[PDB]
Amino acid sequence: HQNSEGRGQAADLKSTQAAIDQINGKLNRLIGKTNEKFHQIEKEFSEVEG
Amino acid sequence: VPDYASLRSLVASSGTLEFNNESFNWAGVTQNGTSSSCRRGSNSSFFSRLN
């Protein structure tokens, strides 16, 4: 802002946090989602089987 | 030939009929065996790769 008193700047945390709440929220849907699974078939081979 | 498709698929994957022949001192036996079913023009013959 700039008035007769001069220039200035001030943040708006209310809407800023509203953006972080949507971002952080999509992270916890994806980070740490891993489902454990084991003994998948051999994916690599050494001889010729056909 | 048992597991026919496997040979086909393994030979297909190689993609080459490149062939060198070696020597096996087949002692005291008749090589170049022949059958009338495997005609090679006039005379009878056999598979080109087998003895």
Side-chain angles (χ1 to χ4, degrees), chain B residues 27-43:
Chain B
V29 284
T30 300
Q31 303 165 31
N32 291 324
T34 315
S35 163
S36 70
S37 59
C38 208
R39 289 206 166 278
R40 182 169 259 100
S42 298
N43 307 31

Side-chain angles (χ1 to χ4, degrees), chain A residues 1-6 8-12 15-36 38-42 45-50:
Chain A
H1 62 73
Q2 185 183 261
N3 62 338
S4 53
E5 266 188 273
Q9 167 260 111
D12 176 77
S15 172
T16 286
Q17 187 64 29
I20 315 293
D21 282 354
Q22 302 177 49
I23 301 165
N24 294 348
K26 289 152 56 161
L27 281 313
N28 42 259
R29 195 219 145 185
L30 310 186
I31 282 192
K33 141 188 163 185
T34 40
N35 306 1
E36 54 199 288
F38 33 61
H39 193 42
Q40 34 186 120
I41 67 193
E42 296 291 323
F45 309 98
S46 50
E47 284 84 353
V48 187
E49 280 164 316

